[PDB]
């Protein structure tokens, strides 16, 4: 089993290497597509070539969800396990419970006397899609790690401006309807990665008249999450906020599972660079 | 075929498949094989298959699917209203 996942990761890495060295080839085939589409001069290298002009029949016959999620995007509704750091604190326990309530298809795991590799392998043995692990400081929640399990990716965000729902008000209970999502101002390929990981973190295939909205807006590289219930009036549709609110911020992104600590870093927040204050998303 | 019997027929199979198959009534004795006995004796068709109650032919009468036929002449108007609402929810799904 574990061997099967091992050689799986091997074959995925090899296909990535071939994809890199075939990007340029895809470009040359697209150019030849355009040339046959409209007769034009053909440029120097592809003009002089013999193998390309020979094998371009199958190639003409040739011809988007990210690859780590690709087979099971919208078929099997994902299952998530949310667990606490180590010898938990009580404020953190309440807030992790709130996160479990916030998502659907979620179950909670107290952690005392565990180790990271044993936990992650046990979760893979059980068969679980997605994992959330929480870290705090003095009651205040501050750090969150998301993983996708079949050697998928992990993201690590910090999270600051948290307020628990009960400490907003002693209100009542949520509805837990399969919610909705709005994604604002996302630009980069990194932005597409994070909207992809969060979309596959939610439930898949909601209704047409579901009455809970969950937002995601980029406000100066600080992903602000809110949650409101809405009921459609005739002229101004009223939104009642419920569920916790907190300011979330990316800082690192691994291409392995969270237990690895030495996978391929596909992004990492640069701090002490000359233009750190300058750029956005960098 | 030659590839699989080469390669020890363990493969990953054909993805998805649909095609309508007709069936005709000739009883199960002729359906089964050539041998001096028999095993099942009813028709190869079900009663629901050879006849379910069809939706009503003439226009002023209503056939439900459980065999209670009504007309628009022997109905009280409230039950007329109920029947219209039931057809409404049926055509609302369909």
């Amino acid at each position: 089993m574990l061997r099967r996942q091992a050689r799986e990761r091997r074959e995925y890495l090899y296909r990535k290497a071939q994809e890199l060295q075939d990007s340029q080839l895809q470009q040359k085939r697209q150019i030849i597509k355009q040339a046959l589409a409209q007769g034009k001069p053909l440029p120097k290298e592809l003009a002089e070539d013999e193998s390309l002009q020979k094998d371009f029949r199958y190639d003409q016959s040739l011809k988007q969800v990210d690859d780590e999620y690709a087979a099971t995007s919208g078929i099997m509704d994902p299952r998530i396990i949310v667990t606490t750091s180590r010898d938990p604190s009580t404020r953190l326990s309440q807030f992790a419970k709130e996160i479990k309530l916030l998502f659907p298809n979620a179950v909670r795991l107290n952690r005392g006397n565990y180790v990271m590799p044993n936990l992650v392998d046990a979760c893979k043995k059980s068969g679980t899609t997605d994992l959330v692990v929480l870290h705090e400081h003095r009651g205040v929640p501050t750090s969150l790690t998301i993983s996708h399990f079949p050697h998928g990716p992990t993201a690590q965000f910090s999270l600051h401006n948290v307020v628990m729902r009960h400490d907003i008000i002693n209100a009542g209970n949520q509805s837990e309807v399969n919610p909705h999502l709005i994604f604002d101002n996302f630009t980069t390929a990194l932005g597409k990665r994070v909207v992809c990981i969060l979309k596959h973190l939610f439930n898949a295939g909601p209704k047409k008249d579901s009455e809970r909205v969950i937002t995601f807006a980029n406000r100066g590289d600080f992903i602000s999450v809110r949650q409101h219930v809405y009921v459609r009036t005739r002229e101004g549709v009223e939104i009642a906020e419920v569920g916790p609110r907190f300011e979330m911020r990316l800082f690192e992104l691994r291409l392995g599972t969270l237990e690895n600590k030495d996978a391929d870093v596909e992004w990492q927040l640069r701090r002490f660079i000359r233009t750190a204050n300058k750029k956005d998303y960098l | 075929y030659k590839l699989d019997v080469l390669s020890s027929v363990h493969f990953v199979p054909k993805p998805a498949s649909t095609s309508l198959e007709i069936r005709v009534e000739t009883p199960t004795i002729s359906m089964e094989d050539a041998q001096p006995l028999y095993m099942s004796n009813a028709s190869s068709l079900a009663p629901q298959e050879i006849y379910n109650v069809g939706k009503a032919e003439k226009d002023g009468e209503i056939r439900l699917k459980n065999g209670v036929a009504m007309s628009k002449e022997e109905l009280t108007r409230e039950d007329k209203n109920r029947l219209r609402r039931a057809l409404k929810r049926k055509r609302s799904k369909a």
Binding site: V107, Y114, N118, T128 | -
Partner: protein, 125 residues
């Protein structure tokens, strides 16, 4: 050759290596005889396999046990599992299969943790 056999025993995070070879009828655990294991209430739990089976079968052999890691109760369960599987292996290798089977039946009917350990992996729902 010297007719010999080797086995392992394992509680949660400890290791119990057991050599078993033909000899004069002794026990040795960490270079000290087995009247001197420490916890002194679980000494009987260490004694358990011998007192389950009998004593002559341990009168005609030689054990050498070395344990590392773990804590008290973990080491103790480790030693008892190691002695069990080692005795069964020696019987399987050099004397009759029927004796091996009656040994195995008496053990597993008593308590299966002697012959197979349970490394406790969790169940997530």
């Amino acid at each position: 050759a010297v007719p010999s056999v080797q086995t392992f025993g394992k509680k949660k995070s400890a290791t119990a290596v057991a050599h078993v070879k033909a000899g004069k009828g002794l026990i040795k655990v960490n270079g000290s005889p087995i009247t001197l294991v420490e916890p002194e209430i679980l000494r009987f739990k260490v004694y358990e396999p011998l007192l389950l089976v009998g004593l002559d079968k341990f009168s005609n052999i030689d054990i050498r046990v070395r344990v590392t890691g773990g804590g008290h109760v973990s080491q103790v369960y480790a030693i008892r599992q190691a002695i069990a599987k080692g005795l069964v292996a020696y019987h399987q290798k050099y004397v009759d299969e029927q004796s091996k089977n009656e040994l195995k039946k008496a053990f597993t009917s008593y308590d299966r943790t002697l012959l197979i350990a349970d490394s406790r992996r969790p169940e997530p729902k």
